[PDB]
Subunit: 227 residues, 3 copies
Amino acid sequence: VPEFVGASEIGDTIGMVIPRVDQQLLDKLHVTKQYKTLGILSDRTGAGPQIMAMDEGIKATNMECIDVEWPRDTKGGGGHGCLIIIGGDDPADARQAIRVALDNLHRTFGDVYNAKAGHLELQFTARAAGAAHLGLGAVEGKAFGLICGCPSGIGVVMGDKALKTAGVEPLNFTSPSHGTSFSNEGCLTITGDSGAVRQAVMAGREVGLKLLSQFGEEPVNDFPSYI
Amino acid sequence: VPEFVGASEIGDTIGMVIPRVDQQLLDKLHVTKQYKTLGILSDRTGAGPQIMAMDEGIKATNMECIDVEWPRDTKGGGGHGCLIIIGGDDPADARQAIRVALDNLHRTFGDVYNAKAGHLELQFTARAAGAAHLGLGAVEGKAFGLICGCPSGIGVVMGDKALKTAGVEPLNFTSPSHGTSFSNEGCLTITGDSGAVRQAVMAGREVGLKLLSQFGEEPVNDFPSYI
Amino acid sequence: VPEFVGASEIGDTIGMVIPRVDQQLLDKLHVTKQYKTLGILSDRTGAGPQIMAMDEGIKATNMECIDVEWPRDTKGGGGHGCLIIIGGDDPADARQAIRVALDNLHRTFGDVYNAKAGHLELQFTARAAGAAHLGLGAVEGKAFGLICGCPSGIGVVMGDKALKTAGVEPLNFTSPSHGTSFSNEGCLTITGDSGAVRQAVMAGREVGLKLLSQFGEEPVNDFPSYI
């Protein structure tokens, strides 16, 4: 079908574009602004990595991020899936943004670490765009970090360490009962100077790996770290 | 255990009847209307199928649907389980409704299609009853269709195609952050003339099968299709 | 890592202490009362058992229970995981409470019964403490019973029978859509005289076993029963 753009085994992620959406359907979608041309990125496993990949798609095109929704999923693991809707006036521009997001998944899964007992996720950008803003609460135009661990108490200690490492501005802390879809994740989000934000995210990574390893298995990443 | 009526491997579904429920317990249950005789249908996998099966049970007896509740479940998949409470004055009537519901499971899973990456669900009736109304938002006395895909973005495209196929009336569109238990499903519900609703549901099926197949596996149904 | 206290294979449970938590983080944690020393118990599988183990920790130390949060988890099963935060003035007292919690897991999983289709959980104490109060709604200083079944309809029948066995006071009934994180559990909580509360919890256990066994498998417990 013409609406299909591509699919990836990374997170069971599918990208599609609707050139002219039915108006009655559009009136039922919870979007920030209606556009007739929609891009759709949808996955079983991952929230942060697809959101950061879509930020690159936004930087590369005239598309706007208009909805981010939050399935509890990861196919039985402890985290989220993701639905991201983008909007613009040009179907070609929408396909390009979805293609760029698909091509960035192997990078944004760079600091996702898996084990039988749980997982860690780290994200970093020197300049956040629209998807990171709508999806993760980033301040647009500024540095952003994300520091997350599962089961959730690991994320609390990762967060304590990150804040003690450098002078950064906390945006939010989300947990199983507040700001997640009852996931088993503790997540610190921050802004500040880019060098300080990087320092804090790297500190969180080191303590998170040490703690998750105490269940007996070295946490494994499937792609090279970008941070 | 006199309360037990039967159990089915389809959906891990169990049906029970309480002839005269304890008043203290009844006062803590979240029902639309109090009755002393309760039937209970409870499952790990499925919402829609058990709800459409119960609609036949309601048509067959004098029982009323008084609660429908929404576990996020499917034993690690992207969907819902279900709790249905029915109320009346006659224990034999309640047991008959539960038996009719269990007997209809093999039919109402006829258009559920499974794959490693996700699933599709379609439902259709020429005349909806009280369980379809309370559970899925159907208009009682009218034709009803349900069109669902997972991961949720597939459900958005299915919905668009259905509405463009025939003149039908939209009821709702539910998604991971609106009107589900943080499931990974996009679901369009419709009414209209029975022939038009049937055409829309069949169109949604065709595009959903094409899209979900793009992950590499043809979606599988375990039972003959009824639609 | 000096924050690490211990890890258990039972429920994938990890315990940690932060001697002096960062103040910006503390302001973003959802606690009843601020303390500078935090203990943290975090797991993938179990709510009631870790909460009951933590009630012993509280009895043994000067720590106060200040948060209980509710991941929908059990690694693809029908239940919850758990995050428990405790607070006090002394890091040694915190580590002792976490230690006592870890050491009681093998007891508080004594009346958890598992099967392919679902699970049962019973808890009992003659005198509830701060964790059972915050996490499960117990009345501090009184006897307390928890009676749960999955899929949730089984919990409804267990609750009805328990109430019919002895004169007890219902505290709450939680279900997929009310007072759970969209879990597939029906759970009755009770107080009253210790003898009558034990009577009721034991009656709920018997009927739960009989019903869950209707799917074809004798439910299995991994530790000796304490009730």
